[model samples]
Target: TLVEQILAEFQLQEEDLKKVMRRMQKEMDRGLRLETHEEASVKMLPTYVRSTPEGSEVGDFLSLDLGGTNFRVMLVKVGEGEEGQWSVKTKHQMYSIPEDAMTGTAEMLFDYISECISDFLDKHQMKHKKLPLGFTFSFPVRHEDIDKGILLNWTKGFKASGAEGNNVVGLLRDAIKRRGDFEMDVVAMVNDTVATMISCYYEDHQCEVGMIVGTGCNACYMEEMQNVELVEGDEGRMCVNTEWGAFGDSGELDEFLLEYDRLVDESSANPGQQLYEKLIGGKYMGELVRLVLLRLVDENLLFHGEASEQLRTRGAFETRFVSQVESDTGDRKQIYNILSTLGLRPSTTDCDIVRRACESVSTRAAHMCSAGLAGVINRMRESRSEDVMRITVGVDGSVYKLHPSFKERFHASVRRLTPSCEITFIESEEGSGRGAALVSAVACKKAC
Candidate 1:
């Protein structure tokens, strides 16, 4: 009865669910148009990476990949392979950024990044020669060229001064110059979503969409230049960064967003923003479950003892912890350890309640993600031949790649929408880093 009650509180009927998907699809379309000039919740900015790798680009390039939590610097080599293929070898180092740098000034953050780049270069003995580098910033940005972009705003709890409206390429360039020990040129800048698309294209020609489903969420796809009304001088096709995480902000009613969802959004660092991201992104899922459990604890239906202070801590329970709870199949050992670690003495019934909570939260996230993908795929299908039934999406990040139950639920939702279409999600490990190198290579070839 406890699980049933929880499910009832979050449940949506099939008809209502269909309505939500249709509304989300329309909102995504609106985002693409509104982001041209005015402020829209979903900033469908353009990533000027207009071309994918042709498998002929050969060079050794440097790549910097900045994600929601960690930063990576890599030395990548790309050369021709057998029969029009490509070989990519990467040597890289990943660093966990300090919290101070994340919330500090722009100079502080990039200064740390510059230090990492310099350390990596030193470790590999790369000196004196200026190397072309590509930067993959996994955040919202606006730019007119491949080598430059202005930070629209901070996401994932980042708030840096002197950065929100400035060109980040310039910031990083200045930071590297400040170091006075590294010689590198920032040749291209891209979001992680676009980088995933480019990385997948380097291996498979069918990759049409790049998607991220981890700490933050976004998607990008190639668009015909004629369809892009904001910019002139047609160059055939370009990649449009669909900051779809901020979907559902056009004064349209989102019937599926429940009260707890609003509570999570209201209490977030940026209130009343990133509505769609709050619904399904890894950054918010655990907190969503926490909010639900807190309510249940208030009712005295779960957590037999008093709720621990750990339970009250924001982000104490991450998405990985939730996944561990859901994946504990046998005797529920890991679930018990997680509860004990959180300072809770949970009964078997309480464990069952937590399992149900995980199912409820994760299932909703999976369905919403799948619906978002469906909307994107449908849009792409509109311009393609009907005979092309196969759709390949290049996906990166931990949630989609590591979560055990997400893929099954996601595929189930997609099948409900387009039964005839065959969909494939390729796991792209470090795709963003490699893709940045590939983008830099493309820029280099163009310059030549």
Candidate 2:
């Protein structure tokens, strides 16, 4: 009876999901309007990626990818194929960034990046010709143009001083100028999500959306320029980074909050921010499951009410364990193996209960993510005034890609919520690197 009560909290009705979709749509509207934008929780930012790849772009371009622990430099070659088709080939080298560079002065960081570029170029022997470059700066930025973005702040272990509030492209350009070993034309700058979409677009021209649900969650979708209230033009579509993670900050998600959800929000470093992301992001999923297990223990429903020290510790149960548990075969042996590591001595019934609990929590996450996506898909159909729309979504991240049931559940629910569209999901492995090149190639095609 107690398990039923807990499960019911996570099982959202179809009607409830439709309501969630509508609420997200309304919030997206508020976020887009100039007057209501400041008050809106989801700040729909214009990414300024004005056009998709035409597939006729032919060039050898350079791509620079930065964010997280490693930096990557790539060279992409795009040319005509045998039968009036197009092809793209890429070569890249990964360079680990030093801790000093990550936390050092802006000059030091840029110099390090410049040195890496030089090394990559020298090894590849492409120093003479000027190549158009695309920089994938995977961080928070304010985009003024396709090639101009103001670095909002440093994240992902980067504490490089004097970079904030300045143009990231300018920093890179200045760094290369200092080296003066090779010449490059940096044509476009893009976020990782935007690059993911564009990279998949090269494969399937219908791809118009890029989404990620890994450690953090966010999405960027192509929007008709006319609907973009912030931008000046109505000539073509521009990709808009929907910071949908902040969707619930203004209380739109007040009805869906469970007691466990409340605790998750309360204990976070940012108590009230990234509310929607917290619900579905990989960083928070295992913690939610752990919290539920603790609750079950308190009720004498798990581990015979004997809580282990590991179970009491925060972040001890990682997100990867959730996937491992769910991917268990029919025997339930996998579940026991994992629980034992977490200091739980579980009965068969206890293992089954925890399995159902994980299903409840992760399914809720998938459905919630789907509802938000539905709002986007429905809006696209409405925007184009089409009865049936065929589209592709380029997706990346461990939660969406690595989780066994997440993709299937998310896709099914997204289709259920928006019955008017034929949607296809594509997993992008090297989208950040290849995508940066595709973006630059497209820009070069337009410019030349």
Candidate 3:
């Protein structure tokens, strides 16, 4: 009788399960329609954006990528740079940010990052009197022109006030100057996604979008001339990065979004933009799962017995935990560990909690991603003059790459939206290290 009760408690009826699936489907559909694909075609890359030289003359350059917690400094030797046709030899060193620096002063952060770069260069003996550096500042930076950008706001949970409105490249250079360790010149400034687009372009010119799904969420895609009305001195056709992280306007709110998403927005730095990402990105994916689990407990849908102290703590769960649970089909030992880690005791009743949390988080992520993709597609459809046929997004992020459900579900969502467009999500060629190097190469050649 107890076993039967557990079965009834944790197991879903076929009909109820179907309903859940249908809800996900509908949310995905909603996400698609929200895509502003018709507005203007998201600019696809012109090259694969890699560092390897295909067969060109070689030149030496430096590239630096300052990401959320890590900064990578690289020395690249690029041979005769034609777009994809250059040989590249690159060496990289990685370093972690100090724990205290997360909330420390801007100078502290920059000084630390600069110190890391200097140390890397010294260790490698990268001797360049005034080596050009392509700085890939991973947070939100607003470029005024090609060689400069101002920090719009800090993402990656950073909020150092002075950095805003200041030239990010100048800031990095200033840091280098303060240390007086090396004469690293800042040549071009770009975001990780833009660098990624360029990197992807070096390989497949068809790739149109560059997306980052790591510590934070953001996308950069080329915008055609006609799409941007206010951009001055247009070269007739330009690839303006859509900073899609700021996509969610105060237009409409769905029921689910109204409930769960509003809270996330209210608590965010911007309190808007990329609302969907806040819900589904790496920073929030696991937390969203935890929220859903907590809600389930409140509703008595799972864990009917005594609740554990760990379950009450915030951010107790992560996507990896759920992945572990689902990955283990027969043996619930890992599942028990997952619960134990969350301070929740695992019983047969928790089986429903596990299943529900996994499906819910996965579905929600897929649905939100679908909406963003659909929005991009819609924007393209509206903006493009020609019969835009094929579009590709150069995508790299842990959620899509490492997370099991992300890739499959995101593709399925795209399929649901765009039947006509041959849209594909290709892996970005290189991480920011080489990508930034390639950026410096391109900028150097363009300048010459």
Candidate 4:
């Protein structure tokens, strides 16, 4: 009866909602295709290193991972075994990024990371001189060479000014010099995706994708030299790593990507890249659900007839919010309490709105995730000319690991793209830490 009335008031019915939903799904599908097109255009498959075996000579090195809400430092020692196999010993300490530090000076942030490294060294009673470091700073970077990258912009709400385009390695090196404690040198610098991908390569030779779904979203895989053009000197025969986030703004967008997405992008530091990350990544999953619920109130979809000011609090809608709604029983009273917890006034009819909003947003997020996986897989198949594609993807980030339906969605997306290909998501066990350690081993062993 309530559904019939809503249809009447909006001069619509079940079919209209279905149409909107279908259009949204179609846009997601197209986005996946667009990702494929972009991937195919790339020149190299930066798929160099394979996974670490039980006895490969990875060597002992320090690994630093600064991403999302955590700063983690690890001392990883890989002992070589017979026949190129390896075993390992690892120690780690984690630090949280203070809320105020997001807007603070670069010195404050880098100092914190350096301190964590110092602390880790002390804990292990390791020497500072000849200390090797493999650093994985998880954000966008412009690389002039393998050992150098300039922080292009900050995500996860960080706004440190001097970070962009500055020699980030020099910044870390300078900070280390000031403390006068441990003498450290960064042997190699890699993005979290690249690090994750490389670490996975050490484990599985066929794994091709490295994806990060934490507070941010990005994926990269090795491309061969035959296709990529614009990356100068990346011409003849090697793998090229392409940043996929830039694909979102290639041209136009559909309605949902436009209307609902514009709200967050316009408010973000880089509006162009904002839309893609918002719908498919962890940073915006819960928040997007919140925004859709708020729209219901404006449309009189029935959450006490109006929205509350407190509902505007950033990240007020967390994954736990929808988790609560999903677990709610048929009792309308419980539904009201759930809404109340989310900072909404609950009317009798508000349960319908709550459920619908959650479903729509969650479904959209899952579907879009699938689309992205599809895009990459489709591209790989076309570019490589292989009928049966076998690949392993290194996945990092709490969101992809812990989110309820994210993995399921990713699987669906991949299957949708290439039903016959064998694609798998390998939990990046070492994540940034092990990846960094590997980089250190490769660089030090080779450079020495």
Q: Which prediction has the highest TM-score against the true structure?
A: 1
Query: How would you encode candidate 4's per-residue C-alpha lDDT over 196-276 as one tens digit per residue?
Result: 776765567676778887777777666544443334343343333444444346432343363556676776667666455
Model number with the top lDDT: 2
Kindly indicate the candidate among 2 and 3 with the higher TM-score.
2
Query: What overall lDDT goes with each candidate model?
Result: 0.79, 0.83, 0.61, 0.62
Q: Give candidate 4 misplaced runs (Cα > 4 Å).
A: 1-57, 81-89, 127-129, 228-241, 254-256, 327-338, 343-352
Instruction: Point out where model 1 deviates above 4 Å.
Output: 34-37, 51-57, 82-87, 233-235, 251-253
> For model 1, where is the 10-residue window of minimal lDDT?
81-90
TM-score of each: 0.94, 0.87, 0.81, 0.81
lDDT tens per residue, model 3, 241-262: 5544544443223333534456
Show the colliding residue pairs in model 1.
none
Clash count for each candidate, listed in order shown? 0, 0, 45, 30
Evaluated at residue 161, the lDDT of candidate 4 is 61
Q: Indicate the residue-level lDDT of 196 in model 2.
A: 88
lDDT by residue for model 1 (1-448), tens: 6557766666655555566667666665655663534665556676776753454457788889886587888888877655333436468788999988887899999999998887888788786668888899887888878888888877777777779899989999999999799788788999999888777765677787899999988888877766666667456777888888887655443667888888887778777677887878888989998888888888778885368999998888888988999889867788899989999988898888888888898888887777777777777776667775687789987788788788788778867876567888888856877788878877887674
RMSD of each: 2.1, 3.3, 6.6, 5.8
Q: Is candidate 1 or candidate 3 better by TM-score?
A: 1
User: What range of 10 consecutive residues in model 3 has the weakest lDDT sum?
Assistant: 40-49
Local error of candidate 1 at residue 165 (angstroms): 1.0
